[PDB]
Design a protein around this ligand. Structure first.
Ligand code: RC1
Length: 445
């Protein structure tokens, strides 16, 4: 079952908080630490449900994982050393874990089965299963290439050169991870850059992986297969997608001044910040530095008056998971915010385009949902927004829909209710406590 929650108008958010670790990097830390030779030590790991599921999948294949103090320590099996799992690998709500693991173990000569929850089971897997079929993996999937899926790798996989058709870092990642156990050179060509945690981290683990960018922006990523991977010390930066929630809340709630510490600032993750700055947001980037091999900074966010802007389709990959919270900010901006190139939103935990549009309408917002776009016209004073009758936003098992609308309720004249807050812990278990500490009033049923 589910647990609804209602957000109420706040008098001002204020404080300094450390945001939880980056989910993308956390997933990969468990995966690469579990695969590599020797020991990997991780500090700052996100302990949300999605990451825990990836950890259990790696344990199922032979890695030993334990938490000593505040450090997760992993004893890896070495490249080529994964063991056949006894039972299905349950990824719950996590597409990142599921899709990357399909590439990782699908190329091994044993059977592996992938299952997940009601939301993950409806998402498309063909985007990863097709290149695996080219590599020689035998695939048994449900119609439409959906879970459950059982893979059986060939004795010797075939390396491929794959041009990713949509701006998916998960597809690029799955093909590169498959390349780790494939003899020869695996090449991934990305016409538009997507988050590059896989490339940066594999290089950090010693992989002979190179990235070449043409002047036209196309990336050619080459990986030599069956090479040694060496355990590493990892310091996980703060999640920029989780940061988006208290950050947008601070921009919208009058009388706010919130500082978020140690936030990942890799440009493939900062499209929302750039967009909000263009809308007039007061976001100060403090002490930009290098930590754990990544760019991080502290962000001081203050109440701002926002104006609608046009968000180009090519910025989408750099902020794809932040469209829900951006749409909420647009609900309080002067004028229209226009966002196109949103086809990928329809295949996430929920069809995010439909869920955001329906949630906004339920809460009095004037918006137009297109097949691949969203136009939102705001009401800066928040008058008439929210839902006085207490009607609940349908979250469709999507944690980001739940968090985005709860942020809306801190600003709207009328409270905003979401039908379920139980999935928030998949990526941000600290959400309720963190927001409450800043002054937000959110009542869990
Ligand atoms: C959607 C989501 O976040 C995704 C995680 C992810 C990664 O490699 O770590 C890449 C993107 O997916 P894609 O563009 O390759 O399809 C994100 O949207 C996910 O984990 O599935 P999140 O919203 O649940 O964080």
């Amino acid at each position: 079952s589910s647990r609804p929650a209602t957000a109420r108008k706040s008098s001002g958010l204020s404080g300094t908080v450390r945001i939880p670790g980056d989910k993308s990097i956390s997933h990969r830390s468990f995966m690469f630490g579990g695969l590599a030779s020797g020991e990997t030590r991780i500090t700052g790991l996100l302990e949300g449900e999605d990451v825990i599921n990836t950890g259990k999948a790696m344990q199922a294949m032979g890695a030993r994982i334990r938490k000593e103090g505040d450090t997760w320590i992993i004893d890896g099996v070495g490249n080529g050393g994964l063991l056949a799992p006894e039972a299905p690998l349950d990824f719950g709500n996590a597409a990142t874990g599921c899709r990357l693991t399909m590439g990782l173990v699908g190329v091994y000569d044993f059977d592996s089965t992938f299952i997940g929850d009601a939301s993950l089971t409806k998402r498309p897997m063909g985007r990863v299963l097709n290149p695996l079929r080219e590599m020689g993996v035998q695939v048994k999937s449900e119609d439409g290439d959906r879970l459950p899926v059982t893979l059986r790798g060939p004795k010797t996989p075939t390396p491929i050169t794959y041009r990713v058709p949509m701006a998916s870092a998960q597809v690029k990642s799955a093909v590169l991870l498959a390349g780790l156990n494939t003899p020869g050179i695996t090449t991934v060509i990305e016409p538009i850059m997507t988050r590059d945690h896989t490339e940066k981290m594999l290089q950090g683990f010693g992989a002979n992986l190179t990235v070449e960018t043409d002047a036209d922006g196309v990336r050619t990523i080459r990986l030599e297969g069956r090479g040694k991977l060496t355990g590493q010390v990892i310091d996980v930066p703060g999640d920029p997608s989780s940061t988006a929630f208290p950050l947008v809340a601070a921009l919208l709630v009058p009388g706010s001044d919130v500082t978020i510490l140690n936030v990942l600032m890799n440009p493939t993750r900062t499209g929302l910040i750039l967009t909000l700055q263009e809308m007039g947001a007061d976001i100060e980037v403090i002490n930009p530095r290098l930590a754990g091999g990544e760019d991080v900074a502290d962000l001081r966010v203050r109440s701002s008056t926002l104006k609608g802007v046009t968000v180009p389709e090519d910025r989408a990959p750099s902020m794809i998971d932040e469209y829900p919270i951006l749409a909420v900010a647009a609900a309080f901006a002067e004028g229209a915010t226009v966002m196109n190139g949103l086809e990928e939103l329809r295949v996430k935990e929920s069809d995010r385009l439909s869920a955001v549009a329906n949630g906004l309408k339920l809460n009095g917002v004037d918006c137009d949902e297109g097949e691949t776009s969203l136009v939102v016209r705001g009401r800066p004073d928040g008058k008439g927004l929210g839902n006085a009758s207490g009607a609940a936003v349908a979250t469709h098992l999507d944690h980001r829909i739940a968090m985005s609308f709860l942020v809306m309720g801190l600003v709207s004249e009328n409270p905003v209710t979401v039908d379920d807050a139980t999935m928030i812990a998949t990526s941000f278990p600290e959400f309720m406590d963190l927001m409450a500490g800043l002054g937000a009033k959110i009542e869990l049923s």
